[PDB]
Design a protein around this ligand. Structure first.
Ligand SMILES: *[C@@H]1O[C@H](CO)[C@@H](O[C@@H]2O[C@H](CO)[C@@H](O[C@@H]3O[C@H](CO)[C@@H](O)[C@H](O[C@H]4O[C@H](CO)[C@@H](O)[C@H](O)[C@@H]4O)[C@@H]3O)[C@H](O)[C@H]2NC(C)=O)[C@H](O)[C@H]1NC(C)=O
Ligand SMILES: *[C@@H]1O[C@H](CO)[C@@H](O[C@@H]2O[C@H](CO)[C@@H](O)[C@H](O)[C@H]2NC(C)=O)[C@H](O)[C@H]1NC(C)=O
Ligand SMILES: *[C@@H]1O[C@H](CO)[C@@H](O[C@@H]2O[C@H](CO)[C@@H](O)[C@H](O)[C@H]2NC(C)=O)[C@H](O)[C@H]1NC(C)=O
Ligand SMILES: *[C@@H]1O[C@H](CO)[C@@H](O[C@@H]2O[C@H](CO)[C@@H](O)[C@H](O)[C@H]2NC(C)=O)[C@H](O)[C@H]1NC(C)=O
Ligand SMILES: *[C@@H]1O[C@H](CO)[C@@H](O[C@@H]2O[C@H](CO)[C@@H](O)[C@H](O)[C@H]2NC(C)=O)[C@H](O)[C@H]1NC(C)=O
Ligand SMILES: CN1[C@@H](CC(=O)c2ccccc2)CCC[C@H]1C[C@H](O)c1ccccc1
Ligand SMILES: CN1[C@@H](CC(=O)c2ccccc2)CCC[C@H]1C[C@H](O)c1ccccc1
Ligand SMILES: CN1[C@@H](CC(=O)c2ccccc2)CCC[C@H]1C[C@H](O)c1ccccc1
Ligand SMILES: CN1[C@@H](CC(=O)c2ccccc2)CCC[C@H]1C[C@H](O)c1ccccc1
Ligand SMILES: CN1[C@@H](CC(=O)c2ccccc2)CCC[C@H]1C[C@H](O)c1ccccc1
Lengths: 205, 205, 205, 205, 205
């Protein structure tokens, strides 16, 4: 519609997607969770697991809010993620780049809350030497911001999901746990948070 | 011609391809169908099917209409899809990104009706454990919009085609059925439609 | 030179590469031919042939002509194909995208005649059962425009070449024929032309 | 914040990322180090090693400094590396391009000191003929600027790290040493520095 | 420095990288040579050789010259090749696109002489049927401009080098010759030069 077209024009004006949208030394809170959809393969020689994981991220960007009565009918909009600031979140265990399977779009509502929910095909490093035993292999998937400390980007955790796991693969899911942490690194004065998912699985008999 | 060159210049003016062309809370109807052209391979270990499928989409964009007597001779135009809004339709079963085999162009007529008909090479997840039996393996291919609900994008179905199936592959087509659906999801207020194709096939001999 | 630099500046001015350069309801004639340079491989299980083919296309674009005495010395220019309109010609049998081996440049002379001669590495679908016999496998390579009918784009044929075929591959060339055709499709009012190359070949063992 | 947004706008103004930020017979000093995170594979037939290495680079760019009291609260910023000048450092032994695993971002503080710390997946040439012996295979990894001599770009060395080496691969790390050098080449009047890492490793069992 | 920043700004002004820098019907002379650095593999079934080759090209572009006393201290500059005109030189035997291993930068001195020295990973077609014999397989590598004839681009030859050949591969170098030539092709009125390298090699006992 015409109201949407006018809204998109205003949202991009004076907006720099390279600048994290903090406000007066108050961090941007980013909620992060993961749904393991499939274990595609396990390479026992090279110590590699191949997965499809659906990442779910959300945060508030105060530059993206609008008055609902100025734009009647427009409750939320669909925007390419390249036009917004997004978290620079990395899988620390990754040995190749991710392949993104979903359209690179985010949903933004009228108070500036953004949802970006990419599904990714990803290969990563793990010791899979007990994968073909009763107590299987257990792998850690550590996620965190690459360039923003706790006072800039407050990474927070949400409930993990196993309901979407594909039943017909040759691996079964024994368990999934999760834990937020915070550490000081040698480089830097400020601490950096992370969210780590621990996945235990094994080959089907 | 000169009239075409002037028309393209007007069509792009004040046009944002990121904004779905709804008008006064009336959704954009999108007709969707599929023609299975080939089954290239079946990976029985990893539970993957490799296909070429020809997707057929059409819809009306009211911003792309023109007066026929202002542009005499110009009944329709060939336009790169990147310059238009297009449906953000996703194959939910996909485990890699699609490879598009056709030129990325759409046809638009004078009342703003768009046709975009991409042929794609695609690999996806399915239980193929009865592929080498009499009754065969049966796979679901679920398609739907990633960011637009029913009141924005009204996805509608059309008749599937088996006539283009390649006769000389090592798999034969036992059947194809189709079904539109509509559900409420936990996330969201508004319902989401989808179009699902069920394909049954088996190995020859 | 200085005259060339001035000419390139004028050629791009008021030029839209998305608009086919028809003139007063007279189609653009496009001459098309093919030289088979190599048969790299044949996949008997999956019914795929791997080739290098040199495509040769030429046409007249009336917007690219210049007065020879305004630009003395300048008989023809070398221009990136991305800055011109080009035919949207497709190999209908293709199962992957082409890999272009040559620089993406075209030659344009002073009366606007364009030559664009890409060499491509291409895999396509064919029944190759019979490849290891005396009479060999016979494959059709069908080429045509994706979005332009006969009254917009008049596809014409030229003499096929076998002189560039590499003698040291493990496949030998039994024969090559070619045929222009024109058909009505279900979609459309206007007929669409094509040029099809029929290649018969066999294993040397 | 608002001060950050204003700062980014000023940093890009009159800034050319193609120009090395020397001033008047001072070179740009670039500190370089490496942390070997994993040996993924060794191809004994083709003489190739496959690694993940974390490169650590830092330098001062005097065009990126700002007055701290003009931008209160803003001590450092996160910037895409493509918008800055960066060292043109090359692995001389490389037989494919690198695959970058981390976000392409750098940290810049108020006096213009830049940190850029890419983790890369890289394959390179080495004689691995004693890899399955007690004393192991020993490989040289030579790094240096491609276009800048010593008086433009002063490459300096820092302490190598083995603490991040993954314990569960099928190769073990016998040792890592490092050495800065400087040589005259036939081409050029000015000498060129390099930093070379020598890595000795062997197969387990 | 400040003089460099001013120089880069002037060099790009009124510069079109698509226009070969001839001057009053006098061709651009391009010196071309090759250093074979490695033979990575030989595929005997498909008739393919896999190499790393270091190409060395240089030429004069009269638009890139500057007065040395206007820019004191600035003898040469490091510039991205994408901002300059470069030779459109092709390996005629290539069956895949090249992978460029070096930074895409060129050196330009004050009288406008450009040096561009890309190292490339390349696969090409050759009859390797005597590779495992005493006299070896002999392959021709033919290089030439794709769109410029002799009167536009004067391709000249320089001394080949085998000093960079890697000693630890499983193939050894029997012989290398080189030869400049000039031929008429069917397309065109004007003759086209080429530089061909003949490499004889064999498997090690
Ligand atoms: C740019 O390149 C193009 C492509 O090659 C080139 O187009 C060709 O131009 C020539 C004109 O010189 C065309 O040849 C003519 O074609 C028609 C028949 O189709 C004939 O009338 C001409 O024959 C002769 O007729 C006269 C008898 O009354 C004689 O006086 C004399 O012998 C004529 O030559 C002649 O064959 C040719 O058809 C086109 N081709 C295409 C595809 O358009 C163009 O000329 C080039 N431009 C420049 C400035 O170099
Ligand atoms: C925009 O979306 C956000 C996030 O969904 C909404 O804020 C949440 O609203 C729920 C209502 O049950 C609260 O329980 C949460 O505390 C809110 N979340 C956060 C992170 O603050 C918000 O209401 C939406 N705004 C509008 C105007 O629709
Ligand atoms: C533009 O294309 C549309 C879609 O083909 C045309 O509208 C259809 O015309 C058919 C056949 O005459 C009718 O039966 C349908 O009612 C129409 N379908 C839809 C989805 O609207 C339309 O006529 C074309 N416009 C012009 C100006 O020719
Ligand atoms: C910007 O960062 C650089 C690098 O960390 C700082 O320079 C170093 O400061 C330490 C003290 O923390 C000194 O011991 C070193 O001598 C400095 N190193 C170099 C290479 O200069 C610099 O002080 C920082 N600037 C600000 C304003 O904080
Ligand atoms: C820019 O570089 C070119 C090429 O290196 C220089 O010209 C060469 O100089 C050598 C050495 O004296 C001469 O023998 C040759 O006549 C030149 N070679 C070519 C291919 O032209 C040139 O002098 C340099 N310009 C400046 C100002 O230093
Ligand atoms: C959850 N998702 C909805 C979420 C949403 O609208 C959304 C939010 C944010 C950005 C983009 C889209 C929209 C579409 C329906 C549903 C999709 C299905 O659950 C799903 C999730 C993960 C993998 C495959 C399928
Ligand atoms: C510290 N370092 C990471 C260190 C780590 O544990 C790590 C990284 C990669 C592989 C293995 C371990 C943790 C997060 C902070 C980061 C440093 C900062 O983000 C940074 C990024 C880019 C340029 C300069 C500085
Ligand atoms: C596609 N169709 C016509 C439809 C059209 O013009 C068109 C309309 C809209 C967008 C793009 C092309 C064009 C001419 C070719 C024909 C294609 C053939 O049916 C086909 C397509 C794909 C696989 C097998 C067969
Ligand atoms: C060429 N290069 C110099 C840079 C330079 O002169 C140059 C670079 C690019 C363009 C013009 C000139 C720096 C010193 C090393 C030298 C070449 C090295 O031995 C090399 C090693 C392995 C593969 C390729 C090249
Ligand atoms: C290309 N053609 C000439 C150039 C030209 O007229 C031309 C080039 C590009 C566009 C338009 C015209 C000279 C350059 C090579 C020659 C063709 C060679 O036999 C060839 C051999 C093998 C595969 C492909 C091509």
């Amino acid at each position: 519609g015409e109201f949407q077209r006018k809204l998109y024009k205003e949202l991009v004006k004076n907006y720099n997607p390279d600048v994290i949208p903090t406000q007066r030394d108050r961090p941007v809170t980013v909620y992060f969770s993961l749904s393991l959809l499939q274990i595609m393969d396990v390479d026992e020689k090279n110590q590699v697991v191949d997965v499809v994981i659906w990442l779910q991220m959300s945060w508030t960007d105060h530059y993206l809010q609008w008055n609902v009565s100025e734009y009647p009918g427009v409750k939320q909009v669909s925007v390419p993620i390249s036009s917004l600031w997004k978290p620079d979140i990395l899988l620390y265990n990754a040995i190749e780049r991710p392949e993104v399977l979903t359209p690179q779009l985010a949903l933004v509502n009228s108070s500036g809350h953004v949802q970006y929910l990419p599904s990714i095909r990803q290969r990563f490093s793990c010791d899979v030497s007990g994968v073909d035993t009763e107590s299987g292999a257990t792998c850690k998937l550590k996620f965190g911001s690459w360039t923003h400390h706790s006072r800039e980007l407050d990474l927070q955790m949400q409930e993990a999901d196993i309901s979407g796991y594909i039943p017909y693969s040759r691996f079964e899911l024994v368990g999934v746990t999760q834990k937020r942490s915070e550490r000081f690194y040698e480089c830097c004065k400020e601490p950096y948070p992370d969210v780590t998912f621990t996945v235990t699985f094994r080959k089907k008999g």
